[PDB]
mmCIF file of C-alpha atoms in Angstrom:
data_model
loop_
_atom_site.group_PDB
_atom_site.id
_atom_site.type_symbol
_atom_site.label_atom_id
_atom_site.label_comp_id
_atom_site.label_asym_id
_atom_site.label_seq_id
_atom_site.Cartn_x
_atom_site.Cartn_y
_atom_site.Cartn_z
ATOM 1 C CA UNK A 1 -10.274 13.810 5.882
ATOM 2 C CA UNK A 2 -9.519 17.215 5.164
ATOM 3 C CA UNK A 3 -6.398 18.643 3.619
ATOM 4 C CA UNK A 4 -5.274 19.840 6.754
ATOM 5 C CA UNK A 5 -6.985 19.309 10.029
ATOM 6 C CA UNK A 6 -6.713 21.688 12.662
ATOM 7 C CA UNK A 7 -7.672 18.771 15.153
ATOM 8 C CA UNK A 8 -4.914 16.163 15.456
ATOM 9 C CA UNK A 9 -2.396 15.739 17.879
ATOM 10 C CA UNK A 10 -3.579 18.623 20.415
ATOM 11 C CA UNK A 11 -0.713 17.554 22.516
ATOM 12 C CA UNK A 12 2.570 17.900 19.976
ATOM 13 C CA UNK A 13 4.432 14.556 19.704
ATOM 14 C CA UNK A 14 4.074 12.080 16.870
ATOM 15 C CA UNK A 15 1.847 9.006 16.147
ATOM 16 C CA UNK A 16 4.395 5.665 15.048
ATOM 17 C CA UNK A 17 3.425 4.484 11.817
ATOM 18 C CA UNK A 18 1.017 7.091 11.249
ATOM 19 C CA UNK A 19 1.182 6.071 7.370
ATOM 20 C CA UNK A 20 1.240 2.582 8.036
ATOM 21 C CA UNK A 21 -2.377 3.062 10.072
ATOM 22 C CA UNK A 22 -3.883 5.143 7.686
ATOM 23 C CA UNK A 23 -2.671 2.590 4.648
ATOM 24 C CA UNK A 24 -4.106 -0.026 7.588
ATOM 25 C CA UNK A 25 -7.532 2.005 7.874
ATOM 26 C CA UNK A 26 -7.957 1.994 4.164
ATOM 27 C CA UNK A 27 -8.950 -1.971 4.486
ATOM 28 C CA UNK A 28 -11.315 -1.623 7.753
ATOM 29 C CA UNK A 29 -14.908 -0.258 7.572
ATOM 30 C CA UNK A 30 -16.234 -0.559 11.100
ATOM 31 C CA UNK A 31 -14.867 -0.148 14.056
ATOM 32 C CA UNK A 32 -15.989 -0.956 17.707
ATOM 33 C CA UNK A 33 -14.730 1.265 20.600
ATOM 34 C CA UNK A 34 -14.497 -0.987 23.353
ATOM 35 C CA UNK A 35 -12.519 -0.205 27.030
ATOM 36 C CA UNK A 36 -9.864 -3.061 27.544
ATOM 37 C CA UNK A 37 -8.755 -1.331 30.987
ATOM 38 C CA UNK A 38 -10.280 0.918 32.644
ATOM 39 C CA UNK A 39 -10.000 4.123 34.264
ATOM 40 C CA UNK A 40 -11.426 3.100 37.695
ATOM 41 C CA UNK A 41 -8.479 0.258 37.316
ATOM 42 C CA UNK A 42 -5.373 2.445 38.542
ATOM 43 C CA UNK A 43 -5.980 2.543 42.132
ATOM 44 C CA UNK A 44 -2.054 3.559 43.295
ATOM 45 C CA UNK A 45 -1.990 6.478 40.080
ATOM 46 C CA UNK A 46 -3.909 9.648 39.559
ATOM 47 C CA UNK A 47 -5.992 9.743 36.554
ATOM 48 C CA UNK A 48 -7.743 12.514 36.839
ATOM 49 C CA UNK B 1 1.594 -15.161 -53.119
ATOM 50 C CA UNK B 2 5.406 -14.470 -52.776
ATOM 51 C CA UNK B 3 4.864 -10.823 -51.680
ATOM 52 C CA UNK B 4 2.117 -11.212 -49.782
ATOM 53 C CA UNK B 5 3.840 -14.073 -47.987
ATOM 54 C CA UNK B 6 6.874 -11.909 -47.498
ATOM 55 C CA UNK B 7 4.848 -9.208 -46.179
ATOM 56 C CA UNK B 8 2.807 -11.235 -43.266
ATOM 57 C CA UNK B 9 6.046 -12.876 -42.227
ATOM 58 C CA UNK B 10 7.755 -9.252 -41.961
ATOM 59 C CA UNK B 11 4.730 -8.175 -40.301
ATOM 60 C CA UNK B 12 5.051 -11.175 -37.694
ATOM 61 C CA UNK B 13 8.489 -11.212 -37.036
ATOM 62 C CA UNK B 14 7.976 -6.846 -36.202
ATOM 63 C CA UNK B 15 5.555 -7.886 -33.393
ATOM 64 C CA UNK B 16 8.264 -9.944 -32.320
ATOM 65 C CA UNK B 17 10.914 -7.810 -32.542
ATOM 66 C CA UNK B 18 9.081 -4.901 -30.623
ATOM 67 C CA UNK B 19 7.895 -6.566 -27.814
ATOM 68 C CA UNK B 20 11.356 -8.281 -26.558
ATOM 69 C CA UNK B 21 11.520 -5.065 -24.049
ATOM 70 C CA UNK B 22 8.504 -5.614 -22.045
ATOM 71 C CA UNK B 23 8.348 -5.483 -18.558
ATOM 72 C CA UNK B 24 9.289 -8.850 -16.540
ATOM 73 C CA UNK B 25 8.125 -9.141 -13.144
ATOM 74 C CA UNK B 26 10.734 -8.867 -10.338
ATOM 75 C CA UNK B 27 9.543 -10.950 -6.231
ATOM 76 C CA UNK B 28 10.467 -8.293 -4.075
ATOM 77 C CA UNK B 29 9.726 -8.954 -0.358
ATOM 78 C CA UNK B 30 7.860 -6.468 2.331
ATOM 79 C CA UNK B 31 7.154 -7.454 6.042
ATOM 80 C CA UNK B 32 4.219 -6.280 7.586
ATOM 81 C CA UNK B 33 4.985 -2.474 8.516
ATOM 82 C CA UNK B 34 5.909 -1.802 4.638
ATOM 83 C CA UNK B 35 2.233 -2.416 3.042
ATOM 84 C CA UNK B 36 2.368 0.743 1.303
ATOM 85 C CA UNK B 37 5.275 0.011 -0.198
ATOM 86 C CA UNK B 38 4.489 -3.678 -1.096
ATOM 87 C CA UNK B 39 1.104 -2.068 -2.407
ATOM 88 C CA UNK B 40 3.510 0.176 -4.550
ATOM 89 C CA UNK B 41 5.317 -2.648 -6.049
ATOM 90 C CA UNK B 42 2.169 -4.740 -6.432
ATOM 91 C CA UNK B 43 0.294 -1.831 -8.581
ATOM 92 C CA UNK B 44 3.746 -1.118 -10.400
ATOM 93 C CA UNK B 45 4.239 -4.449 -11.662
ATOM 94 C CA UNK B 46 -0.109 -5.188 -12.304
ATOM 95 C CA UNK B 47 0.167 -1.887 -14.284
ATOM 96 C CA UNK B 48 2.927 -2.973 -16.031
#
């Protein structure tokens, strides 16, 4: 990671625990991206 | 004999004397969103 990213929270806010997740990551070499709900699933909300 | 005797015993009883103040391990207790900080402790008291 670089020193500072310009690419992070696009939207301002905050991420909970951000330290916590990174100190989290530091154990965990692969990951595997996988939808749990998805998008097509909100039939009485806009999503788009 | 007598001063060489004399001299090891002195020399024993200094590596006692100097190592009374080491450093003596402390349980401290983290839950699970404090890992960096149990990390801390645990590589403050292994260094130690």
């Amino acid at each position: 990671e670089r020193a500072n990213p310009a690419n992070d929270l696009c939207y301002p806010g905050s991420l909970n625990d951000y330290e916590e997740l990174k100190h989290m990551l530091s154990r965990i070499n692969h990951f595997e991206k996988i939808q749990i709900i998805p998008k097509s699933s909100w039939p009485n909300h806009e999503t788009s | 004999t007598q001063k060489a005797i004399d001299g090891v015993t002195n020399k024993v009883n200094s590596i006692i004397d100097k190592m009374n103040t080491q450093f003596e391990a402390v349980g401290r207790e983290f839950n699970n969103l404090e890992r960096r900080i149990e990390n801390l402790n645990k590589k403050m008291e292994d260094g130690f």
